[PDB]
Every structure is written in structure tokens, then in C-alpha cells.
Amino acid sequence: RVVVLTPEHYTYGSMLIAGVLRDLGYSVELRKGGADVVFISLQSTIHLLRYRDIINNIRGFRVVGGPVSMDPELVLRHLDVDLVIQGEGEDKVGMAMEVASLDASEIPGAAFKSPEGFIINEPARCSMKRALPLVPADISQEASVYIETHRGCPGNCTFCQVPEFFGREVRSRPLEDIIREVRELRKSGARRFAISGGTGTLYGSSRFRGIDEDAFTELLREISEITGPRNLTVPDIRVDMVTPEILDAISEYTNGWVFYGIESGSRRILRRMKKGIKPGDVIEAVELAREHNLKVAGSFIVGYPGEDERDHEETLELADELMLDDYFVSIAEPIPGTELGDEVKGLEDEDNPVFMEPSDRKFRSLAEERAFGFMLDSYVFRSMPIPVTDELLRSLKKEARDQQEHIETVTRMLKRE
Ligand code: B12
Ligand code: SF4
Ligand SMILES: [Ca+2]
Ligand SMILES: [Ca+2]
């Protein structure tokens, strides 16, 4: 009857949509990678291009949702789909089914085309009470799953669409809902779990005073009592939203890793990214994490528009001084609908490091050169230095090249080239 399709991976959003359709009373299948109505969950912009042919060849009533829906014009440009639902879609799939079985222009967040242009409705927020996800029988073959704990983020990172997709107010799920969902996923075969939904430490937070360390500690404790502490992680932590109690809870109830989003060591680029942090904040957060005996990983973004060699040098200096336990390096991705996407869509190739000339012609661009250089230097920066070999060098080269290709493709898609 109804089939929910998601490429490459079993995403939490696809499982949630399938579970909502199941609770509504429909016969639902959740497959990775046909029916009368097909709900298509797309998580990356490049999915609009990589799977254009097979999606346009799917029979039946096709409905597309997910993060890519934040730019419905791009989706409808690449995909001849009956309906696109923007934003949260828990309370929208029933009306979409009634449309497939009701006028599509009456669904909040709906977006479709017609011989006289586009009909694009305003999206709306959903209640945090919703159906259990449909867990496929082979979820153990998939960390295994990202559990959403809260929705929305007060941040303003130009490279993130969460504040625009889910809102700027933190809406925390009921703790018992999270516990029951984790219990069900564990019964179904899932063994490794990651928190998700906005920055990690803002669960149970308030609009008036923000961080609630006791709520975060309680969340971590109650989840670890179901999963085991070694099987739980928290992936996105802001350096300005940590306390000693938060770090103690991470140490006692998770695998002991704190994943900071540092992005850059240049104060100028940090201001341009609207991260709301400065290098001193990162240094203090790493020091406080070390004092509580945590493992520390840091996420960095290279190739941001306007980043000259001075900014990259400052980022490398900071990364060396931090001596983190692990480093992750990514090339800036201009997500459509974000401030970074708006800035890159009008940026000429001579000003975009993804299309700027590198000093070494072995690299396809300056951004790939900086990415590979950072990735290589990280193995001599980290607290446990790894002797660089030819195999690791080739692996880093391949990773930088793959990131360069992905970013080039999504940038050319953003500019409608
Ligand atoms: C965990 C995670 C991952 C997982 C994948 C799981 C997943 N994609 O869900 C991993 C770690 C593998 C990953 C990798 C990447 N990720 Co990621 N990831 C996330 C993260 C943090 C949480 C996703 C989640 O579970 N959300 C909670 C659920 C409930 O929300 P949801 O999935 O959006 O679903 C809701 C709505 O979209 C809607 N909905 C969803 N599907 C459908 C379908 C239909 C038919 C309908 C009607 C409605 C509907 O209803 C749901 C409930 O409201 C999000 C950020 C975020 N907080 O959303 C980024 C995010 C999805 N990732 C992003 C990025 C940049 C990437 C990478 C490309 C990074 C890279 N360069 O390597 C890769 C590749 C992704 C890919 N699949 O190709 C972007 C996507 C931007 C875009 N438009 O392309 C996001 C939004 C973050 C960001 N702004 O930077 N990611
Ligand atoms: S803090 Fe994390 S979730 Fe919030 S806007 Fe920045 S990157 Fe997105
Ligand atoms: Ca307990
Ligand atoms: Ca200090």
C-alpha cells in the first residue's frame, strides 16, 4: 500500500515517518535504497541528482520530504514529484495520504507545481508527542541509530539549516518517550546509539536560563541504563555550552568522547560563521574536558568563503595547540537555504576556495589542498601521534578528493549549473 524509501541508510526520520504512517493505520514498508503511494525521504542535496532517474521512474503517488525540502524549488527542478512537504512532517503524512486517496494546497508546508507556477505553503511545527519509529528487521546491520532527543537550536551557524528547518526554540521530547524508543530499538537489534537533534547539551533546556545540566545528566543516565555506557555517544557539543557536571555525565554514562564543533581557529572566520565563539572558548572547553579525563575530538571546516591563508594558518595553530585526541576535517558545504548557501550561490569561482587555484597542482582546488594538509597535520598534532605512511597518505588524498567532488557537485547544483 505505502512504502517509505530512504537511500543509502536507515535514517531516523524515515523510520519515524514510517511509524507515523503505521499508527495512522496504513500498510507500510520501510526499504533502504514500489507501491501506490511512495514516501521519499532524502537527506542530502546530492540525492536530488544521484537518484533523479530512478525517482522519476517510480510509479504511483510520490511524496518527497526531509532536509532537502527546505528548498522546494530545487527538488521540483530535479524531481517530477507530486508533492513536497517542507519541514517537520509527522502531522502531514495523513493529509498527504488523503491527497493520494483533499486538495494539496490545504496542507501546511506543502509545495508542488502547476501550469501557472509553484504553490508553496508555509511550514508548521509539530508536537513532540509522536508515534514510535518503524524499526526494520535488519537495523543491526546499520553507530546504529541517532535518537532525536530535542528539536530546534538557538544557534546561528551559517553552515547549518537546523535553526531554519526546526526553529530556534528548543523543544525537548518527554524522557519516557526516549527511554521507550531506545528500549524498542534495542529489542529490534540496535546496539550503538547516538544522541541527535540540535546541540547535545541543550536537552531539557529552558528559554529563560538555557542549559539544564541535571536534565542532561538524567537523560544520559537513563539511556545508558538501557544501552550500556560504552554504546552511547553525543556527537555535537558546543564549546560554550559545557559545565563540569555535563562533562562528568558524559564521562560516566557514555563512551567518554566529547565531540566539539570548533570549525575554525580564525576569529574572523568564526565571526563570519556566526558561531558565537572565539578561540579562547575552545581552549577553555578543551581544558575543562581534559580536567575531567575525557577523550576529545574536534570538527573543523576548511574552504569557507573569504578564508585566506592567514585564517587557515590560525586554524592549524589552534588545532596544534589543542592536541586533541581526534580531528575531523570537512570542506564547507553550501547547503541550499542556509546563509552559507546564499553567500556561495552568488559567489564567483575566483573567490570560492572550492574553485580557487591551489599552490600544488596535485590538488583539484585550494579547498582540497587545505583539507588534505589539515588531515595530514592532524596525525602529528594529536595526543597519540601516528607515524605517517604511504597508505595513510593515499587514504587522506582519496578522502580529500571525494570531499572536493561532493562539494563541487552540490555547489554546481546550488547555482543551477
Ligand atoms: C545524524 C545525521 C547524519 C547521519 C545520517 C542520518 C540522517 N541523515 O538522518 C550521518 C552521520 C551518516 C550523516 C551524514 C551526512 N550529513 Co547529516 N545529519 C544528521 C543530523 C544531525 C540528524 C538527522 C536526524 O535524525 N534528524 C531528526 C529527524 C526527526 O529529522 P529529519 O530526518 O529531518 O526528518 C523530519 C523531517 O525532515 C520530515 N521528513 C523526513 N523525511 C521525510 C519524508 C517524507 C516523505 C515526509 C513527508 C517528511 C519527511 O519529518 C521528520 C520529522 O519531523 C542532521 C541534522 C538534524 N538535526 O536534522 C544532519 C543533516 C541531515 N546532515 C547534513 C549533512 C551536511 C551531511 C553530509 C552530506 C555531510 C558530509 N559532507 O559528509 C553527510 C551525508 C548525508 C547523506 N545521507 O548523504 C545536512 C543536510 C543538508 C542538505 N539539505 O543536504 C543536515 C540537515 C545538517 C546540516 N544542516 O548541516 N548525517
Ligand atoms: S550549534 Fe549545531 S545544531 Fe545548532 S546551528 Fe550550530 S551546527 Fe546547527
Ligand atoms: Ca534509572
Ligand atoms: Ca585556560
Residue numbers in the entry: 3 to 35, 40 to 107, 110 to 150, 155 to 429
What does the paper say about this structure?
To obtain larger amounts of the enzyme, MmMgmA was expressed in Escherichia coli, followed by in vitro reconstitution using a commercially available cobamide containing dimethylbenzimidazole as the lower ligand. Efficient reconstitution was validated by quantification of iron (3.3 +/− 0.4 per protein) and cobalamin (0.89 per protein). The reconstituted enzyme was highly active, with kcat values of 0.31 and 0.19 min−1 determined by quantification of the reaction products 5′-dAH and SAH, respectively. Subsequent anoxic crystallization allowed determination of a 2.08 Å structure that is similar to other B12-dependent rSAM methyltransferases, with a large active site cleft. Like other B12-dependent rSAM methyltransferases, the benzimidazole tail anchors the Cbl cofactor (dimethybenzimidizole in the reconstituted enzyme) in the active site tucked into the Rossmann fold domain and does not serve as the lower ligand of the cofactor. Previously characterized B12-dependent rSAMs have a hydrophobic amino acid in the lower axial position of the Cbl cofactor, which is absent in MmMgmA. The closest residue that could serve this function is Gln49, which is 8.3 Å away and facing the wrong direction. The lack of a lower cobalt ligand is consistent with electron paramagnetic resonance (EPR) data reported by Gagsteiger et al.; however, when rotated around its β-carbon, the amine of Gln49 is ideally placed for coordination to the cofactor with a distance of 2.5 Å, suggesting a possible alternative that may have implications during catalysis. Interestingly, the MgmA homologs characterized here vary in their methylation activity both in vivo and in vitro, which is only partially due to differences in the native McrA substrates. This suggests that the enzyme has a limited amount of time to methylate G420 before it becomes inaccessible due to protein folding, an idea that is consistent with the large active site cleft of MmMgmA that presumably binds a linear, unfolded peptide substrate.
